[model samples]
Target: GAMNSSNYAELFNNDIKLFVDDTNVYRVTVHKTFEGNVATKAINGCIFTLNPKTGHLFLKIIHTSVWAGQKRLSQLAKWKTAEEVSALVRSLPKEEQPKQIIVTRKAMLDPLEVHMLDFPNIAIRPTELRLPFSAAMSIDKLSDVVMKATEPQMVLFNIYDDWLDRISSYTAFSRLTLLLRALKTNEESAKMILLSDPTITIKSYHLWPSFTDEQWITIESQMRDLILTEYGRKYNV
Candidate 1:
């Protein structure tokens, strides 16, 4: 049966599957036709072989399409070995290179995965904050607040504040007493005194005063619970 000229070009131009023989030789099987009924009736035009170990390459063209095969063979013949072919492939710009390079076994036996270069995963956009204030905030300002608030010390204070009303009155009283003692010794008693006074509404520069902590274990447990609650609320679980 005669090969269709229209379909013949597709066999070479489109995707090519590279096969690794038992001897580890690389090959690409070319066909005279690969479309519709013509494909079933088609014959192998040639096989391009390469021995990476020896760096030898051979183009075995069949008699069925010698004219077309020879034209391709002539263009390819310039590369004497696998190294030269690889060099040429690599030298070509990314836009000019093939979309994919499939590596498989002879007759499509056990196909192997080919990962040339690792590509990074797509990045997700940052989650927007639902601010209570009507005033719009810049990304930098929002980021600053978020960074400051999430710091380990600030987070501990936040957890302590949140658990204050939830815990027993005696526990809260004892905890506050311990914190006051630490503040007295930390040379920041003036700020602590200002904060403790109910009538004085003095504003402090520091967002969270460092609590100088075994009460740490209790705060750690509170932090864990806070994290779980946040996760649950985020997902509506």
Candidate 2:
């Protein structure tokens, strides 16, 4: 029981440490525990950052949990993949079915990556507001409508990090690998449903930067110091 707590602590510490040092990461939030039903239903961590170049903000959220046995872990992995595949299928166009209904990560990122040119022209005129409603509407309503129209769109990318690096057998890993591969090849969806799935090949989306191996290593080392410092404060060890 004590070991479980330490493992969870380490996981939380590692997640917090990972993003806190990243120059791109503007904020990181860790939920060690939650309230009431939320504690039972959901537990996760998130990293948020805005890409100044692309004028888009990305939120990376991870759902993680520690499982007791290989059987339970494998079952969870299978369930997760099935859920993603069904969701992807539902997202396809219902009117016309294409020969290949593939959806790539780049395709998904397009609308989300902001285009400065696409910004709404905010030059509002009394005539355009319809003179009748303009007189009836309060000043606050006009300002509120403008503010709502100008808000930036945000994108969310979910990461299932629990599946990484903790498998006990090649059979289990290979099983998941095969299932994920078949799902992609057959369904034409490039969803990262499993940790064993291939890395996203796109280097940058709309000039927004993607972290390189070297940069990740640097971030990792920086996190190490932060984790140790925080750990030292809480426990004797």
Candidate 3:
């Protein structure tokens, strides 16, 4: 039990649910822009709480609003708005691009790139667990993957307890996305160590370090599971 951090972490995590306790606290997600990069803002792909059976809403929307359940609302407005904005991009005359707005906005200010948003404590690596919702290729691979990414690219995560959507605190998933986006923005490629697991080892490369065969299968499977079973899963075909 004490050997794996997730035992206690998930024990406490699963204990709390989202939205059921409607008479709860308000979670605020505000967007602060520097130079217009929007790295923090764009990092989030999609986030959901555990035991979604409480209601059908798997956090479909997220907003920067300060409403009672603004996290859910922001989930709604931000994505919907971003979609419309994307359509505008395709509709635009061939010559124009969104980067102009990004630059003009001066998104990441003080050009020399000073203040780092992904700090250590907030960049805390996720604790290891015997029963992670996530699947890995092998024990060694799992250790490698977790070790290398324990901190780097870790800001790409967020979470809220089940049934208590209003007062939920986000996890590192949100930060991981931010970490990746920042790397992409600065043109620095982030590396990932692929663990070789029988069930997951299907894909070949780590996207950074680049592995092949059974290793790659793991990534493909994880993505497939996420797509079909997880929030990002599209048509479950």
Candidate 4:
């Protein structure tokens, strides 16, 4: 038996549409599909704006995903929370938005109403790359996703938020230093493990900007100094 439905056919491909409500204010719609079978067929939209006049960019947020499997959809149960976020943004009274809204929207994760200094201006926030996986998935499969994510160039994890404090504040601080030392121990493998041909000049940022034996311990050590000097607070080293 064979059956194909155009209604369901549209479900296979994502349909994205863009519109401008006013100068610098743009609205975007994302139609999520679940390939083999889709539960619902509807267009989900979000609004954002970047005003050159005010030098502010605004993004309408819905939800955030830190791990995996949580797709960015406006949950009906969380309307009150989402509304609170919108209220906070509107209360700010400026066209402030994220500089780049990755496909995996992170606004969803921000507090319902949060505060940040106007100077630094917490505008740009990038989400952790997500990949579909199973408990049985191999490391090679995981690497595949990373390779696809960094198709343009190689990546070095120069700096990352302290998962130790985030995961368990009670955990001893020495573990972080230990982890870092371990990372530097394998600097050579770390550099080209995911990539090859270091002399080819690939673009990367953060503390581990480039790779070579010379940058091994020194660069990683500087990173440790930055973390320690800041009293465990983190910043680009």
Computed on alpha carbons, the lDDT of every model, listed in order, comes to: 0.29, 0.26, 0.27, 0.30
Per-model TM values vs. the true structure: 0.16, 0.20, 0.18, 0.18
lDDT by residue (27-121, candidate 1, tens digit) is 23444554533322212222333221121223232223323334444333222222322433455575544333222222222111112223112
Please give the RMSD of candidate 1 to the true structure.
Answer: 29.9
Pick by lDDT: 2 or 4, better one: 4
| Backbone N/Cα/C clashes per model | 0, 0, 61, 7
Task: Output the better candidate (1/2) by TM-score.
Answer: 2
Give the lDDT of residue 62 in candidate 2. Answer: 25
Candidate 4 positional error at 70, Å:
15
Q: Tell how far residue 181 is off in model 3, in angstroms.
A: 18
- Pairs clashing in candidate 4? 57-96, 57-97, 58-96, 58-97, 63-108, 64-108, 64-109
**Candidate 2 has what TM-score?**
0.20
Residues 1-237, candidate 4, lDDT per residue (tens digit)?
111132323212223111111111111345546585435432212223222122122333222221125344344313333343345344653544432222123443343223223323333232242211111111222233332441122222212122222333212123233333433444334344324545534343222233443543454465455435544434544
Worst 10 residues of 4 by lDDT: 17-26
Model 1 lDDT, full chain set? 0.29
Residue-wise C-alpha lDDT for candidate 2, range 66-185, written one tens digit per residue: 222324433343333223333332443643211121112222122222221222321111111101111111122222332243222223321222222333222322322233333323
Which 10 successive residues of model 1 have the least lDDT summed?
130-139
Best by lDDT: 4
What is residue 23's positional error in candidate 2, in angstroms? 25
- Candidate 4 global lDDT: 0.30
